């Protein structure tokens, strides 16, 4: 009965699209504002295209090229990548926030 | 094959993180040495006080 | 033998003939009771169940 | 002492204004709050450090004399981890997702309650209270400058 | 994992994104939809009052 | 799939060949931090005195 519910509910297909896909996706400017604190020297402090700024940030973060894809208006990430970036961001700010 | 690809991608991610931390090791030791030297100075100062 | 395999059942020792596409891979005990099933190495009906 | 007695005379009174033993003594839990009342900004880590890492129950029971509180204040006055306004505004901007000089009050509450040395929700609501706008946004530059100059 | 974690994740997503959220309990009759709905309401009533 | 299994058996060993180093590095860091902590403790005792 549990197997039949997992089958009709599409539970395994749902897990697979989370693992095989990119369920985390952030607009270039939001990615900058959230995570530029992780890599503050990575962008020359003048104006820059948000997409190119995100490319520079992701290179300075040295993320594996399979963990992300870059779109027309968003960066896409594998599951759990943004969780790690959030943990690292929280660590940097915890000194100032204390 | 899809499961093997996801697994191998995670192993690749873990090895990349280990390599990055292995590179980070040098400056971590330099920092630990400088901060321990500062603590040695501070203990000398506090004993002198 | 191509289409079929023989297995011994852990609860019985009984030897049985099973079709190679009905066998499902098993996760290491490392993944016992994982909180998030997306983390399973082998993702199939038997592992989720 | 390496400290100006003219303000030591004020600190004697300001300490005594915390009176609840019935005499010239006050309990470890109060020590941080009296130091914060006299004008310093000790972290709770610093408070525990100068108190010699007391236990969480001992904090309720053990007590300072003013003669012991004065050097505590002196230690916190002379050396500090305190940052500055120009640093804190750069910290708050991490939450500024749009660049307008404003941040969401619910975000600042969540941050202060969850990160670092966690504040109570009652404290944090008193902090954000009065910085409302029609969007629920706080102007972090002025919030920081007011809290710091307060 | 808990219904409180799902509810808090939705509440934080609504405050962060400013996008409205849904909690959608989907099952057979007897599966626990109404009980979990009560727990979602209990959590929001406590945390967001 | 056979090629992926070969790549996986290569990658796991290549990662273990870094973990063997990380063991050493972690022990070194643990000792250096024990020394620095002892200096910080001596500093703190001297300041309290
Ligand atoms: N989370 C739970 N904890 C304890 N008991 C539960 C829980 N979920 C369901 N039950 C039991 O199962 C019964 C049916 O669940 P209910 O949520 O009412 O079903 P439905 O989803 O069809 O409305 C409940 O009356 C209760 O006795
Ligand atoms: Mg119901």
């Amino acid at each position: 009965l549990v197997l039949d519910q997992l089958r009709c509910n599409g539970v395994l297909e749902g897990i697979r699209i989370c693992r095989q896909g990119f369920p985390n996706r952030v607009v270039f400017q939001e990615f900058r504002q959230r995570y530029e604190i992780l890599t503050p020297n990575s962008i020359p402090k003048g104006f820059m295209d948000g997409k190119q700024a995100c490319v520079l940030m992701i290179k300075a973060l040295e993320l594996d090229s399979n963990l992300y894809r870059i779109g027309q208006s968003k960066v896409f990430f594998r599951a759990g990548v943004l969780a790690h970036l959030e943990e690292e961001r929280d660590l940097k700010i915890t000194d100032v926030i204390i | 094959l899809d499961d093997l690809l996801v697994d191998l991608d995670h192993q690749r991610q873990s090895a990349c993180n280990l390599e990055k931390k292995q590179k980070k090791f040098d400056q971590l030791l330099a920092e630990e040495k400088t901060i321990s030297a500062k603590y040695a100075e501070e203990r000398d100062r506090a004993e002198a006080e | 033998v191509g289409e079929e395999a023989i297995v011994e059942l852990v609860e019985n020792g009984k030897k049985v003939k099973v079709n190679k596409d009905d066998i499902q891979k098993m996760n290491p005990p490392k993944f016992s009771k994982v909180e998030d099933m997306a983390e399973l190495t082998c993702l199939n009906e038997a592992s989720v169940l | 002492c390496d400290f100006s007695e003219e303000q030591t005379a004020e600190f004697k009174e300001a300490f005594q204004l915390f009176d609840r033993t019935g005499d010239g003594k006050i309990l470890y839990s109060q020590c941080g709050d009296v130091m914060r009342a006299l004008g310093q900004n000790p972290t709770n880590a610093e408070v525990m450090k100068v108190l010699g890492n007391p236990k969480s129950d001992e904090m309720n029971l053990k007590t300072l004399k003013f003669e012991q509180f004065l050097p505590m204040m002196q230690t916190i006055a002379k050396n500090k981890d305190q940052g500055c306004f120009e640093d804190y505004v750069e910290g708050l901007r991490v939450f500024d997702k749009e660049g307008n000089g404003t941040v969401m009050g619910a975000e600042i509450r969540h941050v202060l309650v969850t990160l670092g040395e966690k504040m109570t929700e009652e404290e944090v609501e008193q902090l954000v209270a009065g910085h409302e706008d029609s969007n629920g946004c706080i102007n972090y530059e002025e919030l920081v400058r007011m809290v710091l100059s307060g | 994992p808990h219904i409180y974690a799902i509810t808090d994740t939705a509440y934080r997503s609504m405050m962060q994104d400013r996008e409205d959220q849904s909690i959608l309990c989907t099952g057979e009759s007897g599966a626990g939809k109404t009980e979990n709905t009560k727990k979602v309401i209990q959590y929001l009533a406590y945390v967001a009052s």
Side-chain angles (χ1 to χ4, degrees), chain E residues 3 25-39:
Chain E
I3 192 68
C25 294
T26 312
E28 291 187 5
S29 186
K33 310 176 296 303
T34 299
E35 285 290 284
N36 282 278
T37 296
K38 293 174 189 173
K39 301 312 180 188

Side-chain angles (χ1 to χ4, degrees), chain D residues 13-33:
Chain D
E13 178 68 3
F15 173 88
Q16 188 60 89
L17 288 172
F18 301 85
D19 68 355
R20 200 36 44 188
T21 62
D23 67 337
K25 301 194 194 90
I26 211 54
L27 312 176
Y28 269 33
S29 64
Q30 308 304 282
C31 183
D33 294 356

Side-chain angles (χ1 to χ4, degrees), chain D residues 77-140:
Chain D
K78 296 300 298 185
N79 191 27
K80 299 155 168 174
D81 297 332
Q82 287 167 232
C84 66
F85 159 79
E86 300 88 349
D87 199 20
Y88 296 135
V89 298
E90 310 292 306
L92 268 293
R93 200 176 310 110
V94 180
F95 314 110
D96 183 354
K97 67 159 66 192
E98 67 181 54
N100 286 324
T102 61
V103 288
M104 278 294 294
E107 186 74 355
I108 303 313
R109 291 203 308 271
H110 179 242
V111 162
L112 293 172
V113 170
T114 61
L115 300 188
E117 297 188 329
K118 302 188 181 181
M119 306 191 72
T120 63
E121 302 80 6
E122 188 172 330
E123 284 165 294
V124 162
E125 190 266 337
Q126 292 169 79
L127 293 170
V128 307
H131 300 279
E132 174 76 342
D133 82 351
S134 58
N135 318 288
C137 285
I138 299 178
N139 165 227
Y140 55 85

